[PDB]
Structures are given as structure tokens and as C-alpha cells.
Amino acid sequence: NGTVKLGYFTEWGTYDRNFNVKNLDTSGTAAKITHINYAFGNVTGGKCAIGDSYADYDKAFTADQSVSGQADTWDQPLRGNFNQLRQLKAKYPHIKVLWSFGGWTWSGGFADAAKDPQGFAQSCYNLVHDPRWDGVFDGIDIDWEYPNACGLTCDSSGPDAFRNLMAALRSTFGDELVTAAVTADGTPGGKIEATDYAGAAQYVDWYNVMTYDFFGAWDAQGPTAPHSPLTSYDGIPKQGFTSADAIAAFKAQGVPADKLLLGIGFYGRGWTGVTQDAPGGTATGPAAGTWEQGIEDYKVLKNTCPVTGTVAGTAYAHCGSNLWSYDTPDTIASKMAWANDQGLRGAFAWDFSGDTADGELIAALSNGLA
Numbered sequence: 191n192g193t194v195k196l197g198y199f200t201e202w203g204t205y206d207r208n209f210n211v212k213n214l215d216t217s218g219t220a221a222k223i224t225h226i227n228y229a230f231g232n233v234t235g236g237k238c239a240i241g242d243s244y245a246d247y248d249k250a251f252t253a254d255q256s257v258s259g260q261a262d263t264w265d266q267p268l269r270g271n272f273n274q275l276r277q278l279k280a281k282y283p284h285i286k287v288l289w290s291f292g293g294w295t296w297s298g299g300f301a302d303a304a305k306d307p308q309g310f311a312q313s314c315y316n317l318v319h320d321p322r323w324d325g326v327f328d329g330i331d332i333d334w335e336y337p338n339a340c341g342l343t344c345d346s347s348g349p350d351a352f353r354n355l356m357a358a359l360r361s362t363f364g365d366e367l368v369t370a371a372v373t374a375d376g377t378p379g380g381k382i383e384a385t386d387y388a389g390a391a392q393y394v395d396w397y398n399v400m401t402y403d404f405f406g407a408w409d410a411q412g413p414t415a416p417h418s419p420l421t422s423y424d425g426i427p428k429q430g431f432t433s434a435d436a437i438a439a440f441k442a443q444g445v446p447a448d449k450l451l452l453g454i455g456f457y458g459r460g461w462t463g464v465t466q467d468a469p470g471g472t473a474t475g476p477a478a479g480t481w482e483q484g485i486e487d488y489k490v491l492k493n494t495c496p497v498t499g500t501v502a503g504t505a506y507a508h509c510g511s512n513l514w515s516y517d518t519p520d521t522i523a524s525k526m527a528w529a530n531d532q533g534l535r536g537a538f539a540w541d542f543s544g545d546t547a548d549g550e551l552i553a554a555l556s557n558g559l560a
Contacts, residue, residue, distance in 0.1 A: 191448055194536030195556050196224065196538035197539035197542045198539065198542060199214070201241055202245065203543045204249065209543035212274070213547075215281065218548070219549040219552045220278060220281070220282045222553055222556035225285070227289075228288070229290040230292060230333065231290065231292075233292060233296055235299075235302065237313035237314070238317045240317070244270065246270050247269060247270040248269055248270050250263075251269070272323045287327050287328055288329045288330060289329075289331065290332075290333050291330065292334050292335060292371075298343045300345065304337075304354060310358060311355075311358035330366075330368055330369075331370065331371065332356070332369070333371040335371075337351055337384070338351065339385070350386055352387065353389045356370065368393060371397070371400055372397045372400065374404070375431075376431075376435045376439030377431065382440065387445060388440075388443040391446070391449050394449065397450055398453065398538055399437065400453050403417055403455070404416075404419060405431070406459035407459055412464075414472075417459040418517060419433065419502035419504050420434055420504060420521075421434045423501055425501075426502070432502065433525070447532065447535070448534070451537055452526075452536075453538055456487065456540065458507070458514040460484060460485075461477055462512045463475065468499055468513075469506055469515065477513070487543065488545060488551055489544060489545060494509070504521050505520075523557070526559050529558075529559065536559060539555060
């Protein structure tokens with residue numbers, strides 16, 4: 191039972207963002223990690239389903255964008271992101287890849303799935319091991335947002351639905367990987383209290399805990415605050431909304447320490463129109479981002495808005511009228527030291543594409559851990 195260093199690869203990275211699997215190689219990321227989650231597969235009619243057919247297995251890569259350095263061919267059985275993953279594992283054989291299902295957008299279908307779990311499990315296994323790409327995936331990740339609670343949509347399946355689903359997956363996946371990503375809400379009447387994660391814990395290999403997005407510019411007038419604080423701090427708007435308080439909640443319910451991974455966001459959240467040099471103050475609205483307001487990649491923020499302080503185990507950035515909060519190589523290292531003192535199984539990155547070209551965020555996470 192050794193240490194896990196995981197990160198998410200997003201399927202749509204290959205489109206406008208131009209972030210490909212070859213990038214995990216050139217940034218040295220592939221050398222320093224232990225697992226990759228591919229995100230996301232869909233959930234339809236109570237079954238696992240493909241997410242983007244073109245991106246997942248049909249796209250032809252060119253010589254100069256592919257991992258192996260060779261262009262895909264028409265005669266080829268496999269292509270697209272899956273073929274690239276294939277080419278990467280051949281280069282970096284110790285890496286294991288999980289296919290991830292759900293996400294913020296595609297979690298609406300988990301309720302129908304939780305009504306016949308064995309069917310859901312069987313369908314997933316058959317897809318993960320489709321003859322076209324059998325061998326490529328070493329297990330499955332369930333990113334259900336959120337069981338018996340509210341995400342993009344509200345679910346009322348009960349506290350034991352999540353357990354039922356995981357048990358089913360364990361039964362049909364055997365000795366392969368079954369992991370899940372989970373809420374980091376430890377407050378009274380919150381998302382962890384809503385589902386029995388401790389009971390489901392015995393079927394999973396580990397939980398990916400989403401200890402980020404605690405605060406952000408959806409509270410457009412503020413108050414401003416770090417989105418991924420490690421511990422509590424004085425100004426905090428909502429008590430109990432910290433990485434530390436999330437972990438403890440799971441541990442208290444009975445989830446063991448080595449079934450938990452700490453989440454690191456390779457992005458920042460920010461407001462514009464702030465009075466003061468540090469967080470706590472009001473704002474006019476969301477800071478301007480590239481792909482959506484209030485959010486920016488670290489590869490970009492490290493330049494446009496360099497770090498000016500620290501609070502609660504994480505970092506903040508003042509520049510003009512904007513206040514951004516995100517993790518840096520130094521805050522990540524102190525966070526990893528914390529994970530080791532806590533006996534966590536490891537940590538993970540959401541998501542790879544926000545890191546720099548020399549992979550310095552993933553390098554900090556890796557070097558920090560046992």
C-alpha cells in the first residue's frame with residue numbers, strides 16, 4: 191500500500207486549449223506521477239457511456255503532436271486520446287490510467303444508475319475493456335457530483351446509493367482500481383453528512399477529495415477568500431470549509447487515512463475591484479479569466495498576477511484591482527508535508543493542463559510526498 195501521485199487529463203484539452211498527452215511527457219510530468227485519470231466518460235440510461243467519441247478514439251494525431259513521434263494512420267485500429275495514452279504507457283510503463291466517469295456536467299445520470307447498480311457496473315467494465323482499447327485502462331474512477339446532495343443537479347437517492355454503486359463496481363472490477371472523487375464539504379448538514387462514505391470506503395482503493403473551490407467569484411461581490419485553504423483562518427467566511435476540516439470529517443466517519451488523497455488545484459479563483467492588499471475585502475465582480483470568469487490557469491497567473499502573500503496554508507495574489515488565490519510550488523510543498531504527517535495515501539492534481547510547460551506544480555507535489 192504505497193504512495194499515490196495522481197492527476198487528471200481532460201478529454202477536451204485536445205481542442206482549443208491545445209493540451210495533449212505528449213505534454214505530460216515534455217513537461218516531465220509523466221516521469222513524476224503514478225496514476226492518470228482520464229476525464230470524463232458520460233452516464234446514460236443507467237450505464238457507463240463514451241463522452242466524446244472523436245476525441246477519445248478516432249482523432250488522427252500528426253507526427254509532431256503525438257507522443258511516440260509517429261502520425262496516426264487510417265488503417266489504425268485505435269486513435270485519438272486513447273491511442274496517445276497507449277503510446278505514453280509504453281514509454282512510461284509504471285503509470286496506471288483510470289477512466290473517469292461523471293463530472294459536474296454529467297452527474298445527472300447517476301440516480302438511474304443507482305437504481306440498478308449491477309447493470310451499471312457490468313456496462314462500465316465492458317466499456318473500460320472494449321476490445322478496441324483493452325489494456326489501456328487499469329481501473330475506473332467515479333466522479334459523482336453529488337450523491338444525496340446538490341451539484342449542478344440535486345439528487346435524492348439516499349445515503350447508501352453511493353455504497354451500492356461502489357460495491358457493484360468492486361464486484362465486477364475485481365483486483366483492478368476502483369476509485370471515486372468526493373465532496374470536501376465537512377459542515378453540518380453538508381455533503382459528506384449526506385451520504386455514507388465510510389461504508390462505501392471498504393470497496394474503493396481510495397477517495398480523490400475535492401479540497402478546492404471552497405470559495406470563489408460566484409459570490410461576485412465577495413467577500414474574497416482563498417479557494418483552497420489548508421487550515422482555518424480568522425476571516426474565513428464559512429467555518430469548516432478547509433482542506434483540513436474535510437479530511438477530518440471523513441476520518442471521523444471511519445474512512446481510513448490511506449484511502450484519502452489531497453486535492454490540489456492547478457488554477458486560481460479571483461475577483462476584481464478590491465480595496466485592500468489581502469483577502470477578506472469586497473469586490474466588484476469576478477476577475478477576468480481566459481475560459482470562464484473567476485478562474486485562471488496557474489501557467490498564466492504565475493505571470494499576469496504573481497503571488498504577494500500567504501494565508502491559511504495557501505497563497506494569494508494582488509495586482510491592480512484583482513485578488514487571485516492559488517497554490518504555488520512553496521504552498522504545495524507545505525501541504526504535502528501536512529499530508530505526510532496525516533498519513534494520507536497521496537495527492538492529486540486538477541488538472542494537468544493548468545500547470546506550466548516545465549511541470550513545476552506537479553514537480554512540487556511529487557517531491558513533497560513520501
